[PDB]
């Protein structure tokens, strides 16, 4: 890999510079290089990895949705030729490439070395997230992609329920995203709503144990659960 000759610490330093410069493709390449050094990632480093790829794939998904909408309108309309489908396919292929890259880093070998709840649940949530992004564009093995997302989320949920308090931000964010999975991907809006509500209510009852700073961290994600519940009910 092109980052093989750079020091692990330099890659992390440059990932942080890239974030400040809003250069998320560079940020992701730097964190990919750091992961490929083979050592486990710290809490901060896991966050950098997540931020980098979330921003990269977020641009691709937003573009894919614009192009998919144009394509759908085209099939409602003058024939414009193959260009809309071609260009949607180009963006889709690049998006799938990024998801495959992230899933490859998780499989080789982040997840198998992650033993603490905070690292293991984080990586399994990420695995669910990137299979979910694959599911968003899947039209053919679509069922297997969906089940791969579900299975990763479910393993993360099981660990988070046993090893983490209900206010833990990773547990909360996992539940938020698995709820979106149920709503958007699995055609299970009732499961989505039940999960978001139970997650919110159990976190509410645990806030009294927290410091002011942890309270702020947890209530921020609880607000996202409430936002989705408001949208869906």
């Amino acid at each position: 890999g092109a980052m093989g000759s750079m020091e692990r610490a330099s890659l992390i330093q440059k990932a942080k510079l890239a974030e400040q410069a809003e250069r998320y493709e560079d940020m992701a390449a730097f964190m990919k290089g750091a992961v490929e050094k083979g050592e486990e990632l710290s809490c901060e480093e896991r966050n950098l990895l997540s931020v980098a790829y979330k921003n990269v794939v977020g641009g691709q998904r937003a573009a894919w949705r614009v192009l998919s909408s144009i394509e759908q309108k085209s099939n409602e309309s003058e024939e414009k030729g193959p260009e809309v489908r071609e260009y949607r396919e180009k963006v889709e292929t690049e998006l799938q490439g990024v998801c495959d890259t992230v899933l490859g880093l998780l499989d080789s070998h982040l997840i198998k070395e992650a033993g603490d709840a905070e690292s293991r649940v984080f990586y399994l949530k990420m695995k669910g997230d990137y299979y979910r992004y694959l599911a968003e564009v899947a039209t053919g093995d679509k069922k297997r992609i969906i089940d791969s997302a579900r299975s990763a989320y479910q393993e993360a949920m099981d660990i988070s329920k046993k090893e983490m308090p209900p206010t833990n931000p990773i547990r909360l964010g996992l539940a938020l995203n698995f709820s979106v999975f149920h709503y958007e991907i699995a055609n299970s809006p009732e499961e989505a709503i039940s999960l978001a509500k139970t997650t919110f209510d159990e976190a509410m009852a645990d806030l009294h144990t927290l410091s002011e700073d942890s309270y702020k961290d947890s209530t921020l994600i609880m607000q996202l659960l409430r936002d989705n519940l408001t949208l869906w009910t």
Partner: peptide
């Protein structure tokens, strides 16, 4: 748009 993390 619905929220994810």
């Amino acid at each position: 748009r619905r929220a994810s993390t």
